Design a protein around this nucleic acid. Structure first.
Lengths: 164, 166, 161, 116, 121
RNA sequence: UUGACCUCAAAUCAGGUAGGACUACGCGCUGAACAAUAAGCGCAGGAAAAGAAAAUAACCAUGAUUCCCUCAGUAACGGAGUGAAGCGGGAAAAGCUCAAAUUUGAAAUCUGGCAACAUUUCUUUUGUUGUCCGAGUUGUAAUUUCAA
RNA sequence: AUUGGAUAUGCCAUAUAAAGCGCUUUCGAAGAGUCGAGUUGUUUGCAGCUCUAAAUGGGUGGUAUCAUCUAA
RNA sequence: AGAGCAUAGCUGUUGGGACCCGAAAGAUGGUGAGAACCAUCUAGUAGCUGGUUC
RNA sequence: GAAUCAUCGAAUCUUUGAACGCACUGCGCCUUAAGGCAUGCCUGUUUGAGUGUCAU
């Protein structure tokens, strides 16, 4: 058969170098593990029990409904889409929605890496909305690299019927 | 939410994306068995809105029935017989081709403790719901037997009621 | 006649007799103790409700009642107030007296502040005055929970009592 | 197929016992809920006043009873019916208010935690 | 005959050869009776048969009680130790999960329960 | 080489469940002669089914379902015959749960193992607490169901 | 001897919580091989087949615009 | 210047198996081995035959 | 403690039969005479395989 452009765009994924830099920033913003969250909460519980102000947590954003919501609200700075979502319809609209909202986006290879970042078996999509002030330059550099290696590159095959 | 996009995309039933996927998936589904377990629903929006929750005790089974009685009703009864320990919750069309119509049935395990402890699906555990698909108590079964409200949709007339003082 | 019923007839085993046949018997009252004490186990439920001064139905009756003896403008409805109604019988007076005495006993509806609530409102009062609650809520550092003016007012009121 | 009525006296007694069994469970409160007064929907009967299903949300709001507590004190709620005329509103608000004038509502116990 | 109440007051392995001795006694008496016996002979057959039945009852009851004690407060126990009311009764929802409610239903009944009231005539 | 994930497997692995019988009364798929009947087939319960309006009406409007009386042997269909329903009067009355909007300042959710603690129509039944693993972000909780 | 719903009275109560009713210079998502159209049967319903939607839209009525309802 | 309504009895009449009895249909579901046999619809029937009580 | 007695919460209940190790009483297997050994399906556990995708 002939692959439609909306599905054929998932065959062209982010290259080796830029994906490596992407997951390096992401691994600094992994969500708190179930174990780590439990230790922090019981520590506050001991403080409450004995005798008793924090900051807003920073982490990557995951979940399909959550990330699509963040894109629609323009809160996302970078959206990374798994290239092998088994029913492709869950993400087939995501590149176009990221284009409509002007959100930088990339299609990274496989969903196991995305799930590993968030301590799950599988993540169809990840989004970065907020970074610490020291990581503003790193995120800005990756956004330029994603644009130059994924958006500036291709942008013509994603309109063409692939496969066949 | 991303289910508004999936529900809207499912209306374009033979657009370029939907026709290609239906053709591809029909080829795969014909390779597997007639009734085979589905690891996850192919239409996570449609299964979700028909009562399915991604938790233990919820089972998705795919089936193909030859075209040419209702096809959806036939899919429900055959799948319900296939896994007789489960309760058929609902069903939905997922694909079709020249020869077959493909459906997925949502089944619920009434012995799992995640089902028996959920008050929202607790009702299916009661024995009055044994083989609902065989008595026409599913959505397609109710539609098939003209159950509904309005003017659009015998024994008490054929009788002769004879009161004591008459 | 049925083979099952013939089977148990031919057996030397006794039948599982149960004796539950007594009509004309009316259900005994549980629930309210005052009603049970004053209930008449022979009279019907209508006769008992009428004797006790209660209403068995707030609507019409769908037949003829028993006669044992030969008896001898929107503004002024949505705004009028009716001062209850008299208690005809003694039984209703016991029910009314019991209700008011229990409501008076279980009337403490004022919540005293806890250790955290007391400290939370104290830090806000000792900095933003006493009469200005809108400025108290708009503070971000001291009012970390982001309570609105109404909740801070309630914390003040509960602190007083 | 002939439907006989030999159980007509038996059904009369069985329903009476259900009324008494219900009254045994709920001792001091009426065995029926208060029904509104409505008008039958035709030119043949629209001059008659009969009993409705429940009181409209606008009737309950005017009488001072919220829809969440109306059912708890035996006042049925009809979300379907509406007051197209000011007469139906006044006829059934007064019915509710007279009902509340004759009502003894027994208090309930509440859990009050020791701390704040 | 034997008394059941003081039979339970004996050790388990004592009941073993008492059953053994009783069984040979019944077999020997049957051999005697088939060659000619009086009407009393079948009378002690009846008593020794019930005595063996009483003996085996104590052994099985003692073994069953021991199994129950050994499996007390264990998640899974053998089927013979489990309840036997009715197949449907075993499949039914337990009262705990029958009474499970959502947090939506808990709040409704916490704030708006069915009140107790009365209507004055 | 190793690991993550997916897929296909296997196991006398652990824990469960289905079949068959009875069917007077349920509900289905069918189906002759002469009736939407008999028979055939499938599936239940103490009742079943139905059920909180994609319902009526044309009024001063009614208000889930079911059943009874009436409508009415009427309208309609087709002369014969078939034959309802709205209203009206009674019996009983009870209402609700989700999908679709980000918890995003924190998967707040759940099964199982193990270990204690209780509890029992009950040493036979039910849970609770702790810990570990698993499920789950391709979405489990709270919140919302248009009456809002 | 078993158990129902209550009552009364202790002991705990994770309330930094959770609700109803006021107000709005802020919002308000609503189920698709389904509705529907054409054609064949069974009996308007149901089903097969070909095609296949909409958002003040859609269904059903009285108009011959209004009323009523909110399906999959 | 209304004469009807209700109940009961009688008689006639129209339906129900319809005064009783008497010819095989046909169909459905089985048994045995085209034909045969069994059980239900089904009180499917005789324009008639015979009988029908002080 | 009689009972060809009543009640009845504990035990026992041959071979079959939905009938279940395979035939239909034989013929078997494994483990320690006993325990067992049917099929489908659901949740989990464990052991594997894959030229599956990726990371080192």
């Amino acid at each position: 058969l002939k692959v439609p452009p909306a599905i054929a765009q998932f065959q062209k994924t982010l290259d080796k170098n830029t994906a490596t830099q992407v997951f390096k920033l992401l691994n600094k913003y992994r969500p708190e593990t179930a174990a780590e969250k439990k230790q922090r909460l019981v520590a506050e519980a001991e403080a409450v029990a004995n005798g008793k102000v924090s900051k807003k947590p920073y982490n990557v954003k995951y979940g399909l409904n959550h990330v699509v919501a963040l894109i629609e609200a323009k809160k996302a700075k970078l959206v990374l889409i798994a290239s092998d979502v088994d029913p492709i319809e869950l993400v087939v609209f995501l590149p176009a929605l990221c284009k409509k909202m002007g959100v930088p986006y990339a299609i990274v290879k496989n969903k196991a890496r995305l799930g590993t970042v968030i301590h799950q078996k599988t993540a169809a999509v990840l989004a970065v909305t907020e970074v610490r002030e020291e990581d503003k330059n790193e995120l800005a550099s990756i956004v330029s690299a994603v644009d130059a290696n994924f958006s500036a590159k291709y942008d013509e095959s994603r309109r063409k019927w692939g496969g066949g | 939410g991303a289910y508004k996009y999936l529900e809207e995309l499912a209306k374009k039933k033979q657009s370029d994306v939907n026709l290609f996927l239906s053709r591809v998936r029909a080829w795969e589904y014909r390779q597997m068995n007639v009734i085979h377990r589905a690891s996850r629903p192919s239409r996570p929006d449609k299964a979700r809105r028909l009562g399915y929750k991604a938790k233990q005790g919820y089972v998705i089974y795919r089936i193909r029935v030859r075209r040419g009685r209702s096809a959806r009703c036939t899919a429900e009864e055959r799948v319900g017989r296939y896994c007789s320990n489960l309760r058929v919750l609902n069903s939905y069309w997922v694909n079709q081709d020249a020869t077959y119509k493909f459906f997925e049935v949502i089944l619920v395990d009434p012995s799992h403790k995640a089902i028996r402890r959920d008050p929202r699906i607790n009702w299916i555990v009661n024995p009055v719901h044994k083989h609902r698909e065989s008595r026409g108590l599913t959505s397609i079964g109710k539609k098939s037997r003209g159950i509904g409200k309005g003017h659009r949709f015998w024994l008490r007339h054929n009788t002769l009621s004879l009161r004591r003082y008459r | 006649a049925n083979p099952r019923q013939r089977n148990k007839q031919r057996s030397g085993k006794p039948r599982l007799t149960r004796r539950n046949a007594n009509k004309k018997a009316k259900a005994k009252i549980y629930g309210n103790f005052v009603i049970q004490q004053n209930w008449d186990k022979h009279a019907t439920l209508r006769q008992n409700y009428a004797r006790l001064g209660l209403l068995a139905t707030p609507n019409y009756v769908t037949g003829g009642v028993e006669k044992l003896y030969p008896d001898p403008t929107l503004d002024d409805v949505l705004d009028k107030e009716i001062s209850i109604a008299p208690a005809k019988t003694e039984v209703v007076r016991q029910l009314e007296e019991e209700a008011v005495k229990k409501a008076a006993r279980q009337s403490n509806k004022m919540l005293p502040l806890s250790a955290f609530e007391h400290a939370y409102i104290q830090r806000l009062i000792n900095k933003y005055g006493t009469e200005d609650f809108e400025s108290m809520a708009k503070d971000v550092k001291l009012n970390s929970k982001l309570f609105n003016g109404s909740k801070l007012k309630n914390l003040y009121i509960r602190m007083k009592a | 197929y002939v439907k006989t009525w030999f159980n007509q006296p038996g059904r009369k007694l069985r329903r009476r016992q259900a009324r008494q069994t219900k009254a045994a469970k709920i001792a001091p409160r009426p065995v029926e809920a208060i029904r509104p007064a409505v008008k039958p929907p035709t030119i043949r009967y629209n001059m008659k006043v009969r009993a409705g299903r429940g009181f409209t949300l606008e009737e309950l709001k005017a009488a001072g009873v919220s829809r969440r507590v109306a059912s708890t004190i035996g006042i049925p709620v009809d979300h379907r019916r509406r007051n197209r005329s000011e007469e139906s509103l006044q006829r059934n608000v007064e019915r509710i208010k007279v009902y509340l004038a004759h009502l003894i509502v027994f208090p309930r116990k509440a859990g009050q935690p020791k701390k704040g | 005959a034997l008394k059941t109440f003081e039979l339970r007051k004996q050790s388990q392995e004592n009941l073993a050869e008492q059953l053994q001795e009783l069984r040979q006694e019944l077999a020997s008496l049957r051999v005697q009776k088939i060659a000619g016996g009086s009407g009393s002979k079948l009378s002690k057959i009846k008593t020794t048969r019930k005595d063996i039945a009483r003996i085996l009852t104590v052994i099985n009851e003692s073994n069953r009680l021991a199994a129950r004690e050994a499996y007390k407060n264990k998640k899974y126990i053998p089927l013979d130790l489990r309840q036997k009311k009715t197949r449907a009764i075993r499949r039914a929802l337990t009262p705990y999960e029958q009474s499970r409610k959502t947090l939506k239903q808990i709040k409704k009944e916490r704030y708006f329960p069915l009140r107790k009231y009365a209507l004055k005539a």
